[PDB]
Amino acid sequence: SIQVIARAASIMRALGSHPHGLSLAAIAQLVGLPRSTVQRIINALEEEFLVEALGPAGGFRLGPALGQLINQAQTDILSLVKPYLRSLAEELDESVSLASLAGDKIYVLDRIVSERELRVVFPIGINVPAAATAAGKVLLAALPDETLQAALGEQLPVLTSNTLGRKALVKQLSEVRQSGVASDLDEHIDGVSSFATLLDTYLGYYSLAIVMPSSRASKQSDLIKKALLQSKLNIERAIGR
Amino acid sequence: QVIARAASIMRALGSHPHGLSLAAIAQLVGLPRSTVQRIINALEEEFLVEALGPAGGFRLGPALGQLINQAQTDILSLVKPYLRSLAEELDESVSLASLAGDKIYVLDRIVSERELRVVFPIGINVPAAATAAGKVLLAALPDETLQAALGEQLPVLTSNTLGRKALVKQLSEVRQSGVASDLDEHIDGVSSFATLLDTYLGYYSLAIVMPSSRASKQSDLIKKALLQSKLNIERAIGR
Amino acid sequence: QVIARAASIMRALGSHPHGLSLAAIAQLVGLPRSTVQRIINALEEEFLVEALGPAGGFRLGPALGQLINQAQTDILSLVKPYLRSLAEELDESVSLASLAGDKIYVLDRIVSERELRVVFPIGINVPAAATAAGKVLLAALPDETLQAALGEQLPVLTSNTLGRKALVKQLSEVRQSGVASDLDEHIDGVSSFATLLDTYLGYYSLAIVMPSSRASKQSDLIKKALLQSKLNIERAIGR
Amino acid sequence: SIQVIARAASIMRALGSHPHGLSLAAIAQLVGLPRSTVQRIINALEEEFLVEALGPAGGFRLGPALGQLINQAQTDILSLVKPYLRSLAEELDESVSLASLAGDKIYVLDRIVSERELRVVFPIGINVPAAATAAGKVLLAALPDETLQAALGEQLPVLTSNTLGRKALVKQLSEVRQSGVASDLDEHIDGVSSFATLLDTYLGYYSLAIVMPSSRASKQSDLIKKALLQSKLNIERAIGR
Known part of the structure; x- marks a missing residue:
């Protein structure tokens, strides 16, 4: 199908399992993807308010x-x-x-x-x-x-x-x-x-x-x-x- | 950046809990019925969307x-x-x-x-x-x-x-x-x-x-x- | 017709749930402290009245x-x-x-x-x-x-x-x-x-x-x- | 003590046990007194609204x-x-x-x-x-x-x-x-x-x-x-x- 939308979705899934937040690292580990491409996708989602960053703490959690x-x-x-x-x-x-x-x-x-x-x-x-x-x-x-x-x-x-x-x-x-x-x-x-x-x-x-x-x-x-x-x-x- | 297309589609669906025709979705968002169909399919693969039968309608998913x-x-x-x-x-x-x-x-x-x-x-x-x-x-x-x-x-x-x-x-x-x-x-x-x-x-x-x-x-x-x-x-x- | 005296006394007691002195009862009703004492006693024998101790007070009964x-x-x-x-x-x-x-x-x-x-x-x-x-x-x-x-x-x-x-x-x-x-x-x-x-x-x-x-x-x-x-x-x- | 007040009281007692009413007869029987003197006492009480008569039915019950x-x-x-x-x-x-x-x-x-x-x-x-x-x-x-x-x-x-x-x-x-x-x-x-x-x-x-x-x-x-x-x-x- 389309692999990137599925990557994103997997990330959302990961975040919904941890309401307190995840480190870019931990997200990268849970889903089977590299810290880098993950960072990319996060950014994409963040542009849409589907995700927010818990400060320079490099943490992320769901969004508005x-x-x-x-x-x-x-x-x-x-x-x-x-x-x-x-x-x-x-x-x-x-x-x-x-x-x-x-x-x-x-x-x-x-x-x-x-x-x-x-x-x-x-x-x-x-x-x-x-x-x-x-x-x-x-x-x-x-x-x-x-x-x-x-x-x-x-x-x-x-x-x-x-x-x-x-x-x-x-x-x-x-x-x-x-x-x-x-x-x-x-x-x-x-x-x-x-x-x-x-x-x-x-x-x-x-x-x-x-x-x-x-x-x-x-x-x-x-x-x-x-x-x-x-x-x-x-x-x-x-x-x- | 297709992620943004997808997101726009979700947004559209959340505004109409009863469902949208592929057409109506395509019109609301500024995209062609085709590429929309594509993206829907992608989402559907993830259960972020469901199809209301051959009625060609779609609505949010599990x-x-x-x-x-x-x-x-x-x-x-x-x-x-x-x-x-x-x-x-x-x-x-x-x-x-x-x-x-x-x-x-x-x-x-x-x-x-x-x-x-x-x-x-x-x-x-x-x-x-x-x-x-x-x-x-x-x-x-x-x-x-x-x-x-x-x-x-x-x-x-x-x-x-x-x-x-x-x-x-x-x-x-x-x-x-x-x-x-x-x-x-x-x-x-x-x-x-x-x-x-x-x-x-x-x-x-x-x-x-x-x-x-x-x-x-x-x-x-x-x-x-x-x-x-x-x-x-x-x-x-x-x- | 003494029944009416009694009744008047009960009436008096029901108006003052905290109690009355034999005196005050005698005054409220138009009767002498004595005959009142008598009637009280009669009622008390029936538990229609009780005495609040040597305080000489009376109040309704069981x-x-x-x-x-x-x-x-x-x-x-x-x-x-x-x-x-x-x-x-x-x-x-x-x-x-x-x-x-x-x-x-x-x-x-x-x-x-x-x-x-x-x-x-x-x-x-x-x-x-x-x-x-x-x-x-x-x-x-x-x-x-x-x-x-x-x-x-x-x-x-x-x-x-x-x-x-x-x-x-x-x-x-x-x-x-x-x-x-x-x-x-x-x-x-x-x-x-x-x-x-x-x-x-x-x-x-x-x-x-x-x-x-x-x-x-x-x-x-x-x-x-x-x-x-x-x-x-x-x-x-x-x- | 005083016997008539006690007679009355016994009558009240009787009436309170039967909220629906008693016939002068039944009252007379319950208490150990003659229908007559009972009638007398009832009348006395009735004068005080301690009792009421349920019509010519000759019934009585408690009062206001x-x-x-x-x-x-x-x-x-x-x-x-x-x-x-x-x-x-x-x-x-x-x-x-x-x-x-x-x-x-x-x-x-x-x-x-x-x-x-x-x-x-x-x-x-x-x-x-x-x-x-x-x-x-x-x-x-x-x-x-x-x-x-x-x-x-x-x-x-x-x-x-x-x-x-x-x-x-x-x-x-x-x-x-x-x-x-x-x-x-x-x-x-x-x-x-x-x-x-x-x-x-x-x-x-x-x-x-x-x-x-x-x-x-x-x-x-x-x-x-x-x-x-x-x-x-x-x-x-x-x-x-």
Whole structure:
């Protein structure tokens, strides 16, 4: 095809994996290219505000233009998904969250809270180790096996007495990776269990999750996972790739 | 330098989330349908773009998400506190938003403890032309692009919602005064005061949303607290 | 007919929750310290009264609760729906309150869905002289008792909070117009419209609490919906 | 002492037990007095608005004056207790409710909801069978054993697969009745457990309860019951009889 656009893209990819910044060196190493031609391409991107330089520190990181490319698109997928959330939420009378992956942590883009007396409540915009959530697992699975080992940077945090370890985690990732859905049982907050499925949108990967008290979970896991799959099918039908 | 052609194309696609015909792309950017086709193909190979079927339409692609996500989820995570702070200094609701065409999008928000309060949900839309936040963002728009959001004739939400004329005129004012406001232009009884955030990742709006009742009195202190917060936030996250 | 003496004593005690000296009780009611002592003793035998130690003070007792509780918890349970209904007809917050001296007490409340909303918690106090609810209740007060709540000189919550004079004058008006209102007399920017509920268990206040912003326009329809609700509720729970 | 005031009082007592109304007959039977002298006393009370007649139906029920006697006092106890609630709530980071008995159902006068993710949420002003709640048990215990058999009108409702039956219920009432506190484990809402203690105020009996997910309850019952007792001691010190 065209090799230089692909070089550029590989560089962007590299920068998006390291939000704090990269040295021209480190960029050059990650991508399979010489510090020189890299410098060239960076410059090209910088001319377009797709990248910025963190001072004479010779560091680089993503730039302004990015926002304006993505914003509308994103604000639309969300706006389109919102209803599909409420629906699900009211079919199951359980809280549901829509999240995206940001390295080792997922990020909650949206959420509907259950009316129930025994309820699970969290705020939009919250972080939480991907390794401990159903959503996090569902996203981690879809990760290219090369990239995966980035999020699984050596050893995992442990949030409860059930939080998986790298081994059982990967092993299970293999399972979700073709079973379609994932779950967590008191692996994040003791007494809470979640059930998530992947959303493959044209804009990237999202996680659709049900978050509920384990108390009530043990009984209806069956119906939960199903409603999730139905919602995945719908949503993707309307917004997939 | 073909990189710049590509970039111009991406820019074009981000302005039209529903999709563009190879033709329309070719026209918007100053390039021939052919070389454009070429570049599209190049991007498509990278999932930076997708084709809406034999419809010959194109729109943004998967890779995008994975580029932006972390960065974004960080700016937000970093700004969140700066919101609470402001919120508690003024005891008024505050929202952080971004522009999506003619509508702003609320990324985050803190609601006032107060008895007479203004309450809205995260993830809400609202015509940019009617909000302080929307004005602050619209101002920063390149004057070429501006006329996109200001497509033809504005909606009118109240008996005060500005019209294209007074709107642009005022945009010129905010565009160097630094901040913007709206007085019962969105919801009657509500007034807002916003300022621009120029982050390395793009433009955001930091806004105070409050009952006009309480606004008429303290506009002065509001605008100031906003500017102080802009200075802080940008000091820590600017470009 | 000694039953009436007793009752007068209870009445006296309910007006002074902190307690009364046998003396003060004797003076308030038109009876001699002696026969009063007698009756107190009789009531005390029934736990309708208690003695605040050798301090010779007296105040209400345990049995009271068990007499009232069920009845009360029923009126409330019966009124709750009538609240929601009203709330959704007007899309404005509504409160059900009772009088406790100079302050009203919010027994229940439904909060408006709206963006510009008024929010308060159940169980809150607020000077009766400043609320529509408070006025509606104060009106129904026997003119003798009234001068108890209107002890000397009123608090002033805003730059509109009435003064004893205009207050009484207006009480005369509500006292046969049926309903009362307050315009930024409690919290600036908030206005309320209340009506009396004459239940078999006592007097309640049914009120709409809303932003003045939105009030100036629809006072008319508010007062009407209130009256309709009063008529219904009383039809089902009046005396 | 004085016998007629006591006759009257007995009548009031009778009426407060039957909020819907009593026939002069039924009143006469409940209290140990003749239909005649009862009629007399009723009349005396009616002159004072302590009672009303439900029409020629010859029925009677409580009256207006009542409210004005109790209101202030009540609105004060509540106002005084409110803080003691928040305090407790924040010491345990669990929801707490203040309730009173209304026959077979308790009535929630006030409540503070936990900040927590797995939380229990209910509205003020709610009813719920006393036989199924810790609060309800605590109040039922304090009931005179004669009166008790009113609330325990034959057979109980059953809210869960754990809701006690009249037998185990009474048996347990004997226990709380000198242990001081009561509890319910998934007897009201499956997954929810509560721990309550009695408040003996000068104005009557109240229930102070902690309501939490059983999940989190099994672990800290111990500390809960203690904080409850401490709060009872405080509150009563300030508002007891």
